[PDB]
Homo-oligomer: A and B are copies of this chain.
Amino acid sequence: DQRREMILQAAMQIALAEGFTAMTVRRIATEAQTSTGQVHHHFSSASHLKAEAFLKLMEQLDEIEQTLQTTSQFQRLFILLGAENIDRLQPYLRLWNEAELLIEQDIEIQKAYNLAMQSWHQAIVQSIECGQKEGEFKNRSNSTDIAWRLIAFVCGLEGIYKLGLQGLAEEDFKRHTEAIIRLELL
């Protein structure tokens, strides 16, 4: 189809710029420049169209991610973890975090989130095994265990920085992350 996917990118723009709470069947029918009723037509609910615009935008994240010229596999892993936080991807990472908080209210979003994370894991699993088969990383451990623990660590470092804890500086994020990568893989 064409009119459906053209609403899908209308969702995408509003999603990526103004988040989920601005994604109303009305306002995305407005910028798609169709009718509200045509939006009801394709997608079976607004929450279904919110999750569909998320998933397909995370797949936009990771496949603009496969295009960046990296120098080493360590550098490509650092970007994959989200630890580099480049500008071009900043808002895709914004939506990811909004989605993470909406998973208790909206199970379409909660389904989409669990699909994004599963691909994130297999994308890091693919970065580890590639660096290992190329002489860049060592084979200290199972690559699925490393990847689950690198996800654990980068998510856990965020959570602790959320607290305003005393004596824990946010400019040590890149430092602590890089350090856990050398321990696991270098």
CB neighbours (8 Å) of A149 from chain B are: 153, 157, 176, 179-180
Number of copies: 2
Nearest B residue to A103 via CB reads B163
A151 at the interface (CB under 8 A from B): yes
A145 at the interface (CB under 8 A from B): yes
Say whether chain A's binding surface is mostly helix, strand, loop, or mixed.
helix
CB neighbours (8 Å) of A183 from chain B are: 180, 183-184
Q: Residues of A within 8 Å of B, CB-based: how many?
A: 32
Chain A window 105-117, contacts with chain B (Cβ cutoff 8 Å), 1 for yes, 0 for no: 0000000011001
A135 at the interface (CB under 8 A from B): no
CB neighbours (8 Å) of A151 from chain B are: 156, 160
CA distance A121 to B165 in the complex (A): 10
Residue among A121, A148, A164 with most chain B CB within 10 A: A148
Q: A145-B179, A149-B179, A179-B145 are in contact. Are A164 and B118 (CB under 8 A)?
A: no
Taking A113-B163, A152-B159 as given, write out 5 further A-B residue pairs in contact, using a Cβ cutoff of 8 Å, ordered by the A residue number.
A114-B166, A145-B179, A148-B176, A152-B157, A155-B156
